[PDB]
């Protein structure tokens, strides 16, 4: 929880993201972390991550490169592969 927020913040720093837009990525990150915790690695988790990416891009104009980077720092892979 607090760790996830620090992990997202590290990515936001790299990309120079501040202000209200930070909340988009903190929210996405928390959802990815919860999915990983509940589902563990596998196609179900990849489904969830792919769905969240598409939704956040559509609904909030999230930056796809940043979403990949957040996925990577939380799961170990930009596309959510976990053994």
mmCIF file of N, CA and C in Angstrom:
data_model
loop_
_atom_site.group_PDB
_atom_site.id
_atom_site.type_symbol
_atom_site.label_atom_id
_atom_site.label_comp_id
_atom_site.label_asym_id
_atom_site.label_seq_id
_atom_site.Cartn_x
_atom_site.Cartn_y
_atom_site.Cartn_z
ATOM 1 N N UNK A 1 0.814 -1.201 0.000
ATOM 2 C CA UNK A 1 0.000 0.000 0.000
ATOM 3 C C UNK A 1 0.850 1.253 0.000
ATOM 4 N N UNK A 2 1.574 1.469 1.093
ATOM 5 C CA UNK A 2 2.507 2.583 1.152
ATOM 6 C C UNK A 2 3.657 2.312 0.195
ATOM 7 N N UNK A 3 4.050 1.040 0.087
ATOM 8 C CA UNK A 3 5.106 0.659 -0.846
ATOM 9 C C UNK A 3 4.670 0.897 -2.287
ATOM 10 N N UNK A 4 3.427 0.539 -2.610
ATOM 11 C CA UNK A 4 2.925 0.750 -3.968
ATOM 12 C C UNK A 4 2.946 2.233 -4.331
ATOM 13 N N UNK A 5 2.520 3.082 -3.401
ATOM 14 C CA UNK A 5 2.542 4.523 -3.642
ATOM 15 C C UNK A 5 3.967 5.048 -3.895
ATOM 16 N N UNK A 6 4.952 4.528 -3.159
ATOM 17 C CA UNK A 6 6.350 4.924 -3.372
ATOM 18 C C UNK A 6 6.863 4.456 -4.735
ATOM 19 N N UNK A 7 6.443 3.258 -5.132
ATOM 20 C CA UNK A 7 6.836 2.690 -6.414
ATOM 21 C C UNK A 7 6.256 3.508 -7.570
ATOM 22 N N UNK A 8 4.970 3.825 -7.487
ATOM 23 C CA UNK A 8 4.362 4.695 -8.491
ATOM 24 C C UNK A 8 5.053 6.063 -8.522
ATOM 25 N N UNK A 9 5.327 6.622 -7.346
ATOM 26 C CA UNK A 9 5.979 7.929 -7.281
ATOM 27 C C UNK A 9 7.345 7.949 -7.975
ATOM 28 N N UNK A 10 8.090 6.853 -7.873
ATOM 29 C CA UNK A 10 9.390 6.762 -8.550
ATOM 30 C C UNK A 10 9.218 6.923 -10.061
ATOM 31 N N UNK A 11 8.201 6.266 -10.617
ATOM 32 C CA UNK A 11 7.913 6.403 -12.046
ATOM 33 C C UNK A 11 7.443 7.821 -12.399
ATOM 34 N N UNK A 12 6.565 8.389 -11.575
ATOM 35 C CA UNK A 12 6.075 9.736 -11.834
ATOM 36 C C UNK A 12 7.225 10.752 -11.847
ATOM 37 N N UNK A 13 8.226 10.523 -11.002
ATOM 38 C CA UNK A 13 9.408 11.382 -10.966
ATOM 39 C C UNK A 13 10.183 11.332 -12.282
ATOM 40 N N UNK A 14 10.395 10.123 -12.795
ATOM 41 C CA UNK A 14 11.090 9.942 -14.064
ATOM 42 C C UNK A 14 10.408 10.719 -15.190
ATOM 43 N N UNK A 15 9.078 10.773 -15.154
ATOM 44 C CA UNK A 15 8.316 11.395 -16.236
ATOM 45 C C UNK A 15 7.892 12.836 -15.956
ATOM 46 N N UNK A 16 8.248 13.345 -14.781
ATOM 47 C CA UNK A 16 7.945 14.730 -14.447
ATOM 48 C C UNK A 16 6.465 15.003 -14.215
ATOM 49 N N UNK A 17 5.740 13.994 -13.752
ATOM 50 C CA UNK A 17 4.295 14.131 -13.559
ATOM 51 C C UNK A 17 3.963 14.606 -12.142
ATOM 52 N N UNK A 18 3.341 15.783 -12.048
ATOM 53 C CA UNK A 18 2.860 16.312 -10.769
ATOM 54 C C UNK A 18 1.432 16.829 -10.930
ATOM 55 N N UNK A 19 0.851 17.317 -9.841
ATOM 56 C CA UNK A 19 -0.500 17.841 -9.893
ATOM 57 C C UNK A 19 -1.554 16.751 -9.880
ATOM 58 N N UNK A 20 -2.787 17.100 -10.275
ATOM 59 C CA UNK A 20 -3.940 16.192 -10.238
ATOM 60 C C UNK A 20 -3.738 14.902 -11.028
ATOM 61 N N UNK A 21 -2.943 14.949 -12.092
ATOM 62 C CA UNK A 21 -2.745 13.770 -12.930
ATOM 63 C C UNK A 21 -2.043 12.619 -12.205
ATOM 64 N N UNK A 22 -1.342 12.920 -11.116
ATOM 65 C CA UNK A 22 -0.673 11.860 -10.359
ATOM 66 C C UNK A 22 -1.680 10.815 -9.890
ATOM 67 N N UNK A 23 -2.881 11.283 -9.553
ATOM 68 C CA UNK A 23 -3.921 10.425 -8.997
ATOM 69 C C UNK A 23 -4.339 9.321 -9.957
ATOM 70 N N UNK A 24 -4.306 9.613 -11.254
ATOM 71 C CA UNK A 24 -4.617 8.619 -12.284
ATOM 72 C C UNK A 24 -3.700 7.405 -12.133
ATOM 73 N N UNK A 25 -2.408 7.680 -12.000
ATOM 74 C CA UNK A 25 -1.416 6.616 -11.981
ATOM 75 C C UNK A 25 -1.343 5.896 -10.631
ATOM 76 N N UNK A 26 -1.568 6.628 -9.542
ATOM 77 C CA UNK A 26 -1.641 6.006 -8.225
ATOM 78 C C UNK A 26 -2.829 5.041 -8.162
ATOM 79 N N UNK A 27 -3.956 5.446 -8.742
ATOM 80 C CA UNK A 27 -5.138 4.593 -8.782
ATOM 81 C C UNK A 27 -4.936 3.338 -9.617
ATOM 82 N N UNK A 28 -4.403 3.519 -10.821
ATOM 83 C CA UNK A 28 -4.046 2.399 -11.687
ATOM 84 C C UNK A 28 -3.097 1.445 -10.965
ATOM 85 N N UNK A 29 -2.049 1.996 -10.358
ATOM 86 C CA UNK A 29 -1.066 1.178 -9.665
ATOM 87 C C UNK A 29 -1.654 0.339 -8.541
ATOM 88 N N UNK A 30 -2.529 0.941 -7.740
ATOM 89 C CA UNK A 30 -3.182 0.214 -6.649
ATOM 90 C C UNK A 30 -4.023 -0.952 -7.180
ATOM 91 N N UNK A 31 -4.734 -0.714 -8.277
ATOM 92 C CA UNK A 31 -5.542 -1.776 -8.882
ATOM 93 C C UNK A 31 -4.672 -2.916 -9.424
ATOM 94 N N UNK A 32 -3.539 -2.574 -10.034
ATOM 95 C CA UNK A 32 -2.617 -3.603 -10.514
ATOM 96 C C UNK A 32 -2.067 -4.420 -9.335
ATOM 97 N N UNK A 33 -1.664 -3.735 -8.267
ATOM 98 C CA UNK A 33 -1.125 -4.418 -7.088
ATOM 99 C C UNK A 33 -2.147 -5.367 -6.454
ATOM 100 N N UNK A 34 -3.386 -4.901 -6.313
ATOM 101 C CA UNK A 34 -4.454 -5.736 -5.756
ATOM 102 C C UNK A 34 -4.722 -6.968 -6.618
ATOM 103 N N UNK A 35 -4.723 -6.778 -7.936
ATOM 104 C CA UNK A 35 -4.912 -7.889 -8.865
ATOM 105 C C UNK A 35 -3.786 -8.915 -8.738
ATOM 106 N N UNK A 36 -2.545 -8.437 -8.675
ATOM 107 C CA UNK A 36 -1.399 -9.331 -8.515
ATOM 108 C C UNK A 36 -1.511 -10.138 -7.217
ATOM 109 N N UNK A 37 -1.876 -9.456 -6.137
ATOM 110 C CA UNK A 37 -2.003 -10.107 -4.836
ATOM 111 C C UNK A 37 -3.071 -11.188 -4.835
ATOM 112 N N UNK A 38 -4.201 -10.894 -5.469
ATOM 113 C CA UNK A 38 -5.327 -11.822 -5.478
ATOM 114 C C UNK A 38 -5.145 -12.963 -6.479
ATOM 115 N N UNK A 39 -4.698 -12.636 -7.692
ATOM 116 C CA UNK A 39 -4.671 -13.607 -8.790
ATOM 117 C C UNK A 39 -3.356 -14.366 -8.949
ATOM 118 N N UNK A 40 -2.254 -13.755 -8.529
ATOM 119 C CA UNK A 40 -0.947 -14.322 -8.808
ATOM 120 C C UNK A 40 -0.669 -14.262 -10.301
ATOM 121 N N UNK A 41 0.506 -14.725 -10.709
ATOM 122 C CA UNK A 41 0.882 -14.690 -12.112
ATOM 123 C C UNK A 41 0.069 -15.613 -13.005
ATOM 124 N N UNK A 42 -0.185 -15.167 -14.230
ATOM 125 C CA UNK A 42 -0.897 -15.982 -15.198
ATOM 126 C C UNK A 42 -1.761 -15.176 -16.148
ATOM 127 N N UNK A 43 -2.414 -15.861 -17.097
ATOM 128 C CA UNK A 43 -3.257 -15.168 -18.077
ATOM 129 C C UNK A 43 -4.401 -14.350 -17.450
ATOM 130 N N UNK A 44 -4.939 -14.774 -16.308
ATOM 131 C CA UNK A 44 -5.995 -13.977 -15.673
ATOM 132 C C UNK A 44 -5.482 -12.586 -15.269
ATOM 133 N N UNK A 45 -4.302 -12.542 -14.662
ATOM 134 C CA UNK A 45 -3.697 -11.269 -14.276
ATOM 135 C C UNK A 45 -3.420 -10.414 -15.515
ATOM 136 N N UNK A 46 -2.897 -11.036 -16.572
ATOM 137 C CA UNK A 46 -2.633 -10.323 -17.827
ATOM 138 C C UNK A 46 -3.922 -9.754 -18.440
ATOM 139 N N UNK A 47 -5.012 -10.525 -18.393
ATOM 140 C CA UNK A 47 -6.324 -10.009 -18.796
ATOM 141 C C UNK A 47 -6.674 -8.741 -18.017
ATOM 142 N N UNK A 48 -6.571 -8.823 -16.695
ATOM 143 C CA UNK A 48 -6.917 -7.701 -15.826
ATOM 144 C C UNK A 48 -6.067 -6.473 -16.144
ATOM 145 N N UNK A 49 -4.758 -6.668 -16.269
ATOM 146 C CA UNK A 49 -3.863 -5.550 -16.552
ATOM 147 C C UNK A 49 -4.136 -4.933 -17.926
ATOM 148 N N UNK A 50 -4.285 -5.775 -18.947
ATOM 149 C CA UNK A 50 -4.616 -5.286 -20.282
ATOM 150 C C UNK A 50 -5.923 -4.478 -20.288
ATOM 151 N N UNK A 51 -6.926 -4.966 -19.561
ATOM 152 C CA UNK A 51 -8.206 -4.272 -19.456
ATOM 153 C C UNK A 51 -8.073 -2.918 -18.776
ATOM 154 N N UNK A 52 -7.346 -2.885 -17.661
ATOM 155 C CA UNK A 52 -7.137 -1.638 -16.923
ATOM 156 C C UNK A 52 -6.393 -0.615 -17.782
ATOM 157 N N UNK A 53 -5.371 -1.068 -18.513
ATOM 158 C CA UNK A 53 -4.610 -0.166 -19.387
ATOM 159 C C UNK A 53 -5.540 0.499 -20.396
ATOM 160 N N UNK A 54 -6.299 -0.323 -21.117
ATOM 161 C CA UNK A 54 -7.222 0.191 -22.116
ATOM 162 C C UNK A 54 -8.238 1.161 -21.495
ATOM 163 N N UNK A 55 -8.792 0.797 -20.340
ATOM 164 C CA UNK A 55 -9.766 1.654 -19.670
ATOM 165 C C UNK A 55 -9.176 3.002 -19.243
ATOM 166 N N UNK A 56 -7.982 2.977 -18.654
ATOM 167 C CA UNK A 56 -7.373 4.208 -18.157
ATOM 168 C C UNK A 56 -6.967 5.134 -19.307
ATOM 169 N N UNK A 57 -6.519 4.545 -20.409
ATOM 170 C CA UNK A 57 -6.202 5.321 -21.602
ATOM 171 C C UNK A 57 -7.464 6.004 -22.129
ATOM 172 N N UNK A 58 -8.552 5.246 -22.219
ATOM 173 C CA UNK A 58 -9.806 5.774 -22.761
ATOM 174 C C UNK A 58 -10.470 6.809 -21.856
ATOM 175 N N UNK A 59 -10.588 6.481 -20.574
ATOM 176 C CA UNK A 59 -11.359 7.292 -19.637
ATOM 177 C C UNK A 59 -10.620 8.533 -19.144
ATOM 178 N N UNK A 60 -9.298 8.444 -19.034
ATOM 179 C CA UNK A 60 -8.524 9.517 -18.403
ATOM 180 C C UNK A 60 -7.374 10.033 -19.267
ATOM 181 N N UNK A 61 -7.310 9.584 -20.516
ATOM 182 C CA UNK A 61 -6.193 9.925 -21.391
ATOM 183 C C UNK A 61 -4.848 9.601 -20.738
ATOM 184 N N UNK A 62 -4.783 8.479 -20.031
ATOM 185 C CA UNK A 62 -3.524 8.051 -19.427
ATOM 186 C C UNK A 62 -2.462 7.809 -20.502
ATOM 187 N N UNK A 63 -1.213 8.106 -20.160
ATOM 188 C CA UNK A 63 -0.088 7.897 -21.062
ATOM 189 C C UNK A 63 0.306 6.413 -21.056
ATOM 190 N N UNK A 64 0.206 5.734 -22.213
ATOM 191 C CA UNK A 64 0.465 4.284 -22.261
ATOM 192 C C UNK A 64 1.879 3.911 -21.821
ATOM 193 N N UNK A 65 2.857 4.750 -22.155
ATOM 194 C CA UNK A 65 4.239 4.480 -21.775
ATOM 195 C C UNK A 65 4.387 4.495 -20.253
ATOM 196 N N UNK A 66 3.725 5.455 -19.610
ATOM 197 C CA UNK A 66 3.747 5.545 -18.156
ATOM 198 C C UNK A 66 3.019 4.362 -17.508
ATOM 199 N N UNK A 67 1.886 3.946 -18.078
ATOM 200 C CA UNK A 67 1.185 2.775 -17.540
ATOM 201 C C UNK A 67 2.052 1.518 -17.607
ATOM 202 N N UNK A 68 2.774 1.335 -18.713
ATOM 203 C CA UNK A 68 3.716 0.218 -18.826
ATOM 204 C C UNK A 68 4.794 0.294 -17.740
ATOM 205 N N UNK A 69 5.341 1.489 -17.537
ATOM 206 C CA UNK A 69 6.385 1.681 -16.528
ATOM 207 C C UNK A 69 5.896 1.382 -15.106
ATOM 208 N N UNK A 70 4.673 1.807 -14.801
ATOM 209 C CA UNK A 70 4.051 1.511 -13.513
ATOM 210 C C UNK A 70 3.809 0.005 -13.348
ATOM 211 N N UNK A 71 3.312 -0.636 -14.402
ATOM 212 C CA UNK A 71 3.110 -2.083 -14.374
ATOM 213 C C UNK A 71 4.436 -2.797 -14.100
ATOM 214 N N UNK A 72 5.492 -2.313 -14.742
ATOM 215 C CA UNK A 72 6.810 -2.912 -14.599
ATOM 216 C C UNK A 72 7.360 -2.831 -13.171
ATOM 217 N N UNK A 73 7.225 -1.670 -12.538
ATOM 218 C CA UNK A 73 7.823 -1.489 -11.212
ATOM 219 C C UNK A 73 7.047 -2.276 -10.150
ATOM 220 N N UNK A 74 5.760 -2.500 -10.401
ATOM 221 C CA UNK A 74 4.931 -3.256 -9.467
ATOM 222 C C UNK A 74 5.033 -4.778 -9.636
ATOM 223 N N UNK A 75 5.037 -5.251 -10.882
ATOM 224 C CA UNK A 75 4.993 -6.692 -11.166
ATOM 225 C C UNK A 75 6.311 -7.311 -11.633
ATOM 226 N N UNK A 76 7.221 -6.482 -12.142
ATOM 227 C CA UNK A 76 8.470 -6.966 -12.711
ATOM 228 C C UNK A 76 8.496 -7.027 -14.234
ATOM 229 N N UNK A 77 7.338 -6.797 -14.858
ATOM 230 C CA UNK A 77 7.196 -6.831 -16.317
ATOM 231 C C UNK A 77 6.263 -5.706 -16.768
ATOM 232 N N UNK A 78 6.600 -5.025 -17.876
ATOM 233 C CA UNK A 78 5.771 -3.922 -18.382
ATOM 234 C C UNK A 78 4.410 -4.408 -18.852
ATOM 235 N N UNK A 79 4.321 -5.695 -19.185
ATOM 236 C CA UNK A 79 3.081 -6.254 -19.716
ATOM 237 C C UNK A 79 2.433 -7.234 -18.740
ATOM 238 N N UNK A 80 2.990 -7.310 -17.530
ATOM 239 C CA UNK A 80 2.393 -8.056 -16.433
ATOM 240 C C UNK A 80 2.684 -9.551 -16.328
ATOM 241 N N UNK A 81 3.668 -10.040 -17.077
ATOM 242 C CA UNK A 81 4.076 -11.435 -16.940
ATOM 243 C C UNK A 81 4.716 -11.681 -15.579
ATOM 244 N N UNK A 82 4.171 -12.650 -14.852
ATOM 245 C CA UNK A 82 4.708 -13.075 -13.570
ATOM 246 C C UNK A 82 4.712 -14.598 -13.556
ATOM 247 N N UNK A 83 5.858 -15.192 -13.250
ATOM 248 C CA UNK A 83 5.942 -16.648 -13.192
ATOM 249 C C UNK A 83 5.214 -17.187 -11.964
#
